[PDB]
Amino acid sequence: SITQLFDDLCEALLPAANRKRAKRSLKKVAYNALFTNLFQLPARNKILMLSFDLRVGGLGPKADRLEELVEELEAVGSVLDLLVQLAGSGPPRDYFLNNKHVGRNVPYSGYDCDDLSVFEMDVQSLISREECLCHSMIQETLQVMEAAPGTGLPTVGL
Amino acid sequence: NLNAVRETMDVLLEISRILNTGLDMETLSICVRLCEQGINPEALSSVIKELRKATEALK
Amino acid sequence: AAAAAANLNAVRETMDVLLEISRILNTGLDMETLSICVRLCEQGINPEALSSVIKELRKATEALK
Amino acid sequence: KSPNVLLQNLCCRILGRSEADVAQQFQYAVRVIGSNFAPTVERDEFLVAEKIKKELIRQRREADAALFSELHRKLHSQGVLKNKWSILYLLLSLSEDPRSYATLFAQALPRDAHST
Amino acid sequence: LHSQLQSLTLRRLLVWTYDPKIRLKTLAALVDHCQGRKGGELASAVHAYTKTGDPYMRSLVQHILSLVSHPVLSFLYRWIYDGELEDTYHEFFVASDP
Structure with a gap:
């Protein structure tokens, strides 16, 4: 249903409230833009190059998590190659953090x-x-x- | 099998959440199943960024 | 023009002197690898960290050979 | 270029492979380089120089210890190098003797005394 | 702290120096519990500070013990494999008779 999977996609991105002709015109923007690229490198490496930029600006454990999932997602490759393209498009406690005062054997x-x-x-x-x-x-x-x-x-x- | 393809689809949401992609849960299953057909993912990066562009001109 | 060719000369000099300091110190590096380690050190990177990596990848290329 | 793509060229120079082949090592190189990016010791080319002379003298190679002093000045003469401390700190570490104790001699300052 | 005085205020110091108000609380009370103890009897009175449970103190004192008990385990590994005890000051618990 490849001719329909583009019709359901055009519904989700349509914001709820003419809602009957806009879907007809937005399906054009989906096709007018799909065939521009078609007219005109490993997969996991592109994540690490984004894993690096994570650790630099802090937030180490999150970067150690992004690699933790792609290691279990092995045991589909073209799906993660789509997420790395839209990495910057998105929209803009725990007391057992450092807390040297709690632990079993905390090192000096x-x-x-x-x-x-x-x-x-x-x-x-x-x-x-x-x-x-x-x-x-x-x-x-x-x-x-x-x-x-x-x-x-x-x-x-x- | 539907239990396996649910887990493999559930793990894949998180790596799309920390990578700061706007894809919610519904648009993900649409795009995963569409990529599962065999379409090249280098093009899908352009339709979503344009559908989200023409959507903003309305608001 | 000219100031874009005078810079390509002052870089081939320095990249030729750093290759002399590299051989009298007997680092196993060569002219191709050494241009990578110089670029990295320009952006600002711990040479105590970068040298642990080179001391490791060279330590694993033997287990495969 | 960027340091992340540049780290992968290094893993292809040392290990002879393509970036699609070697990706376990490059996963280990991002672990070490990342989270250890900022320099930890105060930077000065004077102290690192007096340790490459002290090392070439220790190998009875007293002639190359006075040749380095003439090669280290040329680096300042041209002036295309911004961080001269780093590249020397690294070239010294990868140095092998063609043929003990270091808490007695001069070490770099810690940078912990300052409020970084 | 001195490099920033050139900004920090009183209420800003309290958070800066809230932790070294504890390490300077254990050490300043660890040197009074062991006043006249010399030799091994001191390495046994800085070990009676580990039964505390506080994860911040039990991981500090359990480090000073790892330094103070190094000379003790130097006689022991000497008086076991070579049998040559030597301590002009009487520290080891094995006292010889001339």
């Missing part, structure tokens, strides 16, 4: 000051989020409260 470390320095940035981002909200909540409504009479109002636009 001495002060770190590189875990407490990335434990105050975990808090500084919190106070900087709940402050942009109050900057994006008093702005979205004062831009309407003070304007020309009848701009932001939809009933006056009739």
Whole structure:
């Protein structure tokens, strides 16, 4: 049902509410764009090149997880080759973290000051989020409260 | 077999979640089954990025 | 033009001097491999980490030979 | 290029293979290089120089210890090299003797004293 | 801490120096429990600090024990394989008679 699997795909990406002619026109954009590439390298390596860029900017264990799944997905190759293409298109606690004070046999470390320095940035981002909200909540409504009479109002636009 | 092809489809969602791909659960099974036909995946990367483009012009 | 050819000369010099320091120190590197390790060290990378890798891939190419 | 694609050329130079063949080693090279990217010791080419002379003198090769001093100046003469500490720190580590204790002698500073 | 004074304040120090308020709490109370102990009797009074359970202290003191008990295991591996005990100061628990 390859002629239908493109028809069901065009429904999901259609945002819910003419919804009867847009699907007819969006199926054109699906075909008008599918045959441009057709007119005109291993698989796991492309993940590692993205695994590297993970570890550099921190978040090591997540990168050790991305490789943990592709190792069990072996025991389909063309599917992961599609996900690596859309890697950047997406939209933008645990106390048993470092916590040298809990464990069975925790090894000697001495002060770190590189875990407490990335434990105050975990808090500084919190106070900087709940402050942009109050900057994006008093702005979205004062831009309407003070304007020309009848701009932001939809009933006056009739 | 449907128990196996469910697990193999469930693991594949996570590697598409941490790779920050916008594919939700429904569009994934559509694209997995469509890639399972034999279509070249280098082209599917363009239709999804364009369907999402013309979708934004509406909103 | 010219300033794009004067830079290709000042790089073939330095890549020829680093090959002299490489032989009097008796590193097993050659002119092709050494240009990879120089590029990496320009972006900023731990030479204590990068040298552990080369000391390993050269240590595994023998188990296969 | 980028360091991630550049690390794979290295695994193809040392091991003679194509990138579709050798992918277990390149999985081990991303593990070590990554999470160990930032330099850990204060950088100075002076200290690393006085350790490549001290090493070529120790092999009774006192003539090449004074030739290096003339090759290390030329590096500064041309000026296309930004990090001269790194490439020497590496060339020294891969050095083999054609033919003990190191907590007594001069070691690089730790960078832990500073608030990195 | 001194390089940043050129910004940090009092309330910012409390979090910076909240951990070294503990290591300087065990060590400053580990040198009083073993005051007059010399020789092995000291390596036995820095081991009575491991029965604590606190995962941060039991993994600190259990490291100082691994250094203090190195000389003790130096006589032992000497008085077992060679039988030549030598300690001008009386530390080993095997006392010889001239």
